[PDB]
Design a protein that fits this description.
2 copies of one chain form a homodimer.
Chain A lengths: L1 E5 L5 H11 L4 E4 L10 E4 L4 H4 L6 E4 L5 H9 L10 E2 L6 H17 L2 H9 L16 E4 L3 H12 L4 E5 L8 E5 L4 H5 L4 E4 L13 H4 L6 E5 L8 H9 L3 E6 L19 E3 L9 H17 L14
Bound molecules: NADP nicotinamide-adenine-dinucleotide phosphate (NAP) (2 copies) and 2-oxoglutaric acid (AKG) (2 copies).
Chain lengths: ~300, ~300
């Protein structure tokens, strides 16, 4: 078999060699413009149209969890990827644990009032503060997928009340499952902490806006680990300035890098990371891809597949 | 039975009523100066000498995990507590989980470089940073007791390499046990994070000093959750200023409240909480005390007992 590989910034030579060793019968090459030779599988991130157009590939693997970029490019360029070609993404491959590390750390940080103690420390002021209680710190996960479930599981360990929101009902024993737009209001009503692990799709753009934020309990917290387009940043700033939202930690933004003129940078209740919440671990990704190709060859059901009609 | 209760600041009336309901055969009263009536058990925190002197109690329960204060008072006033009287403390009673919340949150905070991203955010500067790896983030727990073990267990969940230090060897399957002063140097050599959960005893005063800190790996972190006397604060500041220690989070200090002139307050790499890492949960404490008294009455082995000769 023949594999073409393309990634705009990863260690391309490292990946080729690691793919060759995991799939020794395979010829792996980096894709460059003009290369119209045969290929069975394409491993891509932000690929140019030309890499895929007209190719009858056995599969394409997007080298990330999110596929909003490749799918929006296919919408604008329907000739890029034949409907015959199955599209896969990276499920977990280390990003699950990475989202658990980020979420658990910051949820506990807020639950233990480290933000308030930092403010008081800035004035050299010693003052024990009242403890928060788990019954008032219900956590809601917007999005209940591969990463959402992982974050829910790790927070349940700490005995926080937990709820999740998705399109379809979930069966997680101690997590209250809300489903659909008709249940979103009820889901938000108790979310002391709101964690966003949704995909970017046309149905979810701008979902974290003024109307959503004002349904939250007072003194709520926002963790945006998904996509910048999910949040209307001026609406968030207004809810931070009114005291509706006590704190927001944001890893993703409508424009990346976040422009220096954004008021989010210096807002006292905002914490910013530069889109680093969860990156695939190359060796786990090479193992996921090699195992998935082997399953495709054997006719075993795989499920890590993108549905172009639903958008994720 | 008769129980006298004394605590300088807790909700005394709440505790009396809760003890009455957990031990309905018991007469519970708040101790005031001049009260020389009989008593079988004393529940105390920072008690005056007069409360205990000359009393042949069946047991005294110190209402905290640490007993350095009561034991140093008994040293200065040997008449305060007859050697006949067994002394107990609060084992866990909720403080285990509270130490896990604090430690896990801040270890993950440092592991994910949230401290560096905060510095960069202060300048509106966007810059993904290299990931740290678990093999370079060995965590050492100074003290391997009721709370030390709980913290070790919760950090093992995150797959950090783990080691502990105590007087006696431990058998925790994935935690390397170091024991005694003769093994302290070797224990420190790999501690990227040093977590202090030792008791204050004459043998441990000032143990975190210049000689200990310089045995740590470069860019180490310090979490002091135990007693302020364990740390020589000027030595810590020097290791923070030389870059030996990248960050210190401190809940306890040689003088409490930490005086405003301490350079720790405004040091950029120091985080301060006002001795709030783990407070006993009254209802768990009343359950621990009532169950321990019942076991004493039935002749069942109890072990939560202070050893006045060893000092803890
Ligand atoms: N560094 C970073 O910040 C970073 C890294 C990796 C991933 N991410 C983000 O995380 C996202 C999720 O990854 P994942 O692997 O967890 O995706 P996933 O397994 O596909 O899970 C997506 C979940 O979102 C829910 N969802 C989709 N559309 C919805 C709608 N209209 N209403 C309600 N719920 C909806 C789905 O519901 P059903 O279960 O009912 O289908 C599903 O539970 C990615 O899309 C990416 O944007 C960010
Ligand atoms: N809010 C707060 O900040 C807060 C709250 C609660 C407790 N604390 C502190 O936490 C401490 C520990 O509580 P705990 O219940 O875990 O106590 P513990 O169960 O008695 O554990 C103490 C541990 O320290 C070790 N140790 C004692 N002396 C030592 C020495 N000379 N060299 C090496 N190791 C030594 C002991 O070793 P062995 O196991 O070999 O005996 C033991 O493992 C308390 O003393 C208190 O100061 C702080
Ligand atoms: O988009 C990226 O920069 C990689 C991390 C991510 O968000 C994803 O895997 O979808
Ligand atoms: O000493 C206190 O203020 C209570 C918390 C503590 O450190 C202990 O339980 O020993």
């Amino acid at each position: 078999m023949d594999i073409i590989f393309y990634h705009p910034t990863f260690d391309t030579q490292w990946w080729i060699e690691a793919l060759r060793k995991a799939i020794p019968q395979a010829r792996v090459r980096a894709w460059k413009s003009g290369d119209n030779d045969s290929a069975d599988y394409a491993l891509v991130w932000h690929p140019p149209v030309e890499m895929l157009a007209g190719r009858d590939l056995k599969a394409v693997f997007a080298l990330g969890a999110g596929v909003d970029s490749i799918l929006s490019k296919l919408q604008a360029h329907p000739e890029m990827l034949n409907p015959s070609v199955p599209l896969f993404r990276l499920e977990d491959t280390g990003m699950g644990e990475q989202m658990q590390e980020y979420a658990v750390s910051q949820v506990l940080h807020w639950f233990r009032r480290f933000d308030d103690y930092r403010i008081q420390q800035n004035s050299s002021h010693w003052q024990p503060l009242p403890e928060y209680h788990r019954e008032d710190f219900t956590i809601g996960i917007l999005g209940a997928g591969v990463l959402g479930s992982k974050v829910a599981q790790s927070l349940q360990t700490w005995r926080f009340p937990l709820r999740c929101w998705s399109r379809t009902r979930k069966s997680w024993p101690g997590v209250q499952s809300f489903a659909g737009r008709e249940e979103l209001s009820a889901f938000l009503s108790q979310c002391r902490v709101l964690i966003n692990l949704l995909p970017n799709t046309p149905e979810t753009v701008g979902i974290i806006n003024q109307q959503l934020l004002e349904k939250l309990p007072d003194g709520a917290y926002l963790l945006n680990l998904a996509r910048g387009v999910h949040v209307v940043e001026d609406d968030l700033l207004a809810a931070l300035d009114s005291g509706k939202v006590k704190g927001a930690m944001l890893d993703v933004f409508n424009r990346e890098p976040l422009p220096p003129e954004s008021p989010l940078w210096q807002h006292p209740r905002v914490t910013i990371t530069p889109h680093v919440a969860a990156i695939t671990r190359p060796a786990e990704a090479v193992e996921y891809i090699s195992r998935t190709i082997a399953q495709l060859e054997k006719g075993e059901k795989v499920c890590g597949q993108v549905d172009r009609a639903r958008g994720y």
